[PDB]
Structures are given as C-alpha cells and as structure tokens.
Design a protein around this ligand. Structure first.
Ligand SMILES: */C=C/C(=O)Nc1cccc(-c2c(-c3ccc(N4CCN(C)CC4)cc3)[nH]c3ncn(CC)c(=O)c23)c1
Length: 246
C-alpha cells in the first residue's frame, strides 16, 4: 500500500524471542539482522519518528500474516538487563548515561508533539555498549491525571520517566515496594512520593520529585532532563564517589 512495503520472501525468521502475537529474530534480504513482530497503529506512529534513540521501523508487510520489521536490539529489554547478571556491576555513571539516552529519545518525541503513554524499563531496549532505545509505541508508572482522567500528555511521560529513574537506581525493583495498585493511587493522590533510593544522591531524587510535581505544566521538559543527565557528573555531582552498589 505504501513505500514501507517489502516482499515477505525477503525475510527469514530464525529464533523466537517472545510471545503475547510473537517477536522473532531474523535476516532481512541476506545482509541485515532484524526483529520481526508478527496492530498497524504502532507502525504508523513509527513511520513519522526517526531518531537514534528510538527503535527504528524498517519495513512492513500488510498482507496476513502481518509483519513489522524493526531494528534488532541484541540485549533485550532494560528491565531484564538491570535484573540480570549486569545489574550488580552497573554503577551510577552507567545508569545516568542510560537515562540520558532515554531522555534524548523522549526529547525527540516531545519535539514531534507525540506521546508515548507506556514509558518504563520494560519498554526500553538495550543493545551493545549500553545503548538504550525507546520502544513499544501499569498504574505505578502512570501520572495521576492520566490514570484518573485519561489526560495523557508529554508531561505524563515525564512523570513516567521519574518512576523509571527509580528502576534504574534500584536496578530493576518494582516501584512503591510492598504497595498494591489501589494503595499507590490513594497515597499518591494524597501527596505521597517515593523516597530517595539507597545510595542515590539527593540531586537525582530531586530530579525525580520534579518529574512528580502535581501540576503537569511544572514538570520539566525532556530537553531539560536530557541536558541535566548528560552534564550530571560535571555540573551537579563533580565529587561523585562509588558506593557499595551505586
Ligand atoms: C522486558 C522484556 C522484553 O521486552 N522482552 C522482549 C520481548 C520480545 C522481543 C524482545 C526483543 C529483543 C530481545 C533481544 C535479546 C533477547 N535475549 C534473550 C535472553 N538472552 C539471555 C539475552 C538476549 C531477548 C529479546 N530484541 C528486540 N529487538 C527489537 N524488538 C522490537 C522493538 C524487540 O522486541 C526485541 C524483547
């Protein structure tokens, strides 16, 4: 139907990665390794977004079975990355850089006037050299005005980014530990915010709390978050010292 179309025979499905449809690792033509998701709204959104920190759409097959060919991220989702063997070795410099890449991708989304709506570690993908990219275009990750009234905006994504900062600094732990969804909603609406993770510097938790401001228009932009995180160990914590875990 459009210029993202390709012949199905040009794809070779090699390994199954996940289920829900399914996602496969394969080869496009004979030269390019790709991820193949086996619905159109996701592709239509990606067709307009091209950024180094967003999993890139490659091609689409519109005749059933429907395929969505995408960039292959070799290390899986960030959640599983943090929770696996790597987590014990990651320290604050690596986690802040990873968060910086995520904000760079979201800063692009922001400039394009799009909204993600489900930002969290399980929807970031990891590649080689600690490359992180936003993918997959959850009350504990959702801003109150979006969870209660369906007001999803780039500012609800910033709220989500704040929660995702707790995932990074706890290396994959679930937010609001020990609390069920209904208790989080009741407590957050009454003003509760998660405290400073252990070994997390106050300056990073202040950034979290800014993402968690009641008024969505007072939450920082992703442009701001990206610059703050890129500059973090010169402008904000130039005397950082490694701890027991961060
Ligand atoms: C948070 C879990 C998650 O998102 N899993 C997941 C489901 C479906 C597809 C992908 C995926 C992967 C991917 C890469 C590498 C791995 N590994 C399996 C376990 N060994 C130990 C390490 C490597 C699993 C999954 N790569 C992908 N590339 C692109 N996409 C489309 C956006 C993927 O979905 C994807 C992960």
């Amino acid at each position: 139907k459009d210029a993202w179309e390709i012949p199905r025979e040009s794809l070779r499905l090699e390994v199954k990665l996940g289920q829900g449809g399914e996602v496969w690792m394969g080869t496009w033509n004979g030269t390019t390794r790709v991820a193949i998701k086996t619905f159109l709204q996701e592709a239509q959104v990606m067709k307009k977004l091209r950024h180094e920190k967003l999993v890139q759409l490659y091609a689409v097959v519109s005749e059933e079975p429907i395929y969505i060919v995408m960039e292959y991220m070799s290390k899986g989702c960030l959640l599983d990355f943090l929770k696996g063997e790597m987590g014990k070795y990651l320290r604050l410099p690596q986690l802040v850089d990873m968060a910086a890449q995520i904000a760079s991708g979201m800063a692009y989304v922001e400039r394009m006037n799009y909204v993600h709506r489900d930002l969290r570690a399980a929807n970031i993908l990891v590649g080689e050299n600690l490359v992180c990219k936003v993918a997959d275009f959850p009350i504990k990750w959702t801003a109150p005005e979006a969870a209660l009234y369906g007001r999803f905006t780039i500012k609800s994504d910033v709220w989500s980014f704040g929660i995702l900062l707790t995932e990074l600094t706890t290396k994959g732990r679930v937010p609001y530990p020990g609390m069920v969804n209904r208790e989080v909603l009741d407590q957050v609406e009454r003003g509760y915010r998660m405290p400073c993770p252990p070994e997390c510097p106050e300056s990073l938790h202040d950034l979290m709390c800014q993402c968690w401001r009641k008024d969505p228009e007072e939450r920082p932009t992703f442009e701001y978050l990206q610059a703050f995180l890129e500059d973090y160990f010169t402008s904000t914590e130039p005397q950082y010292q490694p701890g027991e875990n961060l």
